[PDB]
Design a protein around this ligand. Sequence first.
Ligand SMILES: O=C(O)c1ccc(C#CCCO)cc1SCc1ccc(Cl)c(Cl)c1
Length: 289
Amino acid sequence: MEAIPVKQFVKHIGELYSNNQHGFSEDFEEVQRSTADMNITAEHSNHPENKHKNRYINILAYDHSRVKLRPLPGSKHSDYINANYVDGYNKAKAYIATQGPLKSTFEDFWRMIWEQNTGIIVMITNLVEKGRRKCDQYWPTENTEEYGNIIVTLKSTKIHACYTVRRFSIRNTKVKQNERVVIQYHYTQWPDMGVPEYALPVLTFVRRSSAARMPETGPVLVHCSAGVGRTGTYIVIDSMLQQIKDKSTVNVLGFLKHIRTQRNYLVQTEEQYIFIHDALLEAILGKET
Ligand SMILES: O=C(O)c1ccc(C#CCCO)cc1SCc1ccc(Cl)c(Cl)c1
């Protein structure tokens, strides 16, 4: 289970795709079994005081990698957010993978952003999809909105074909310097029926949202609804692009098995697993052709 050279990768995708995606199925099964023989605790996630802070009952934040909110005078569980640090290529905690914030966790969400020096939000969901509530709107439709001590001001919006870029200016009321630029990359193209037919617009979304990262800011916050499926998909695509650039190799299976110890279910389906491969195929074939 070493890194596949970039030249042999598109060839490898053909193999994985053949015989009704048998190879893909084996790999994804191996990913699902990577969790086996591993008891990873998520005690804070399961605490009665924290249960209302979780979007889904079964989508937990592993204790060891969980993002801790600075404590608040009084409660003991005021440190909890359903979020985990996740590694990137050759960088620990390059991301914060989190759920789409609830109405009740808006203050927590925005406090985590401040405390972690987060400069980029990657939103991979629509608020409502196929008539179902996926994420609550945590940012202002226009101008300014207040979430605890974080005052959020919408500065500009660029609505592209498949994604929206919202430039915010954030401020802490308890801080006297107390102003920060936060950019949100929102992937908006979600079909009524079916699911992502093309990898090229997602690849463009990944490249642009990734290049917007500022040195040496905090981790890039990536969320969808549960913050596992599309979040995992983004993290792998982005990390593998970095690996390709640095050493012309790809390690999808190895990297995914590793991040799965950091947040439960990152890359939730075989379809998302296959999608990772298509995005990378597009990136490889795109170079020199
Ligand atoms: O919606 C799903 O959960 C989902 C379900 C299936 C597929 C597939 C496939 C081909 C295999 O048949 C992809 C996605 S998500 C695709 C995606 C969109 C936007 C971004 Cl920014 C990223 Cl990173 C990934």
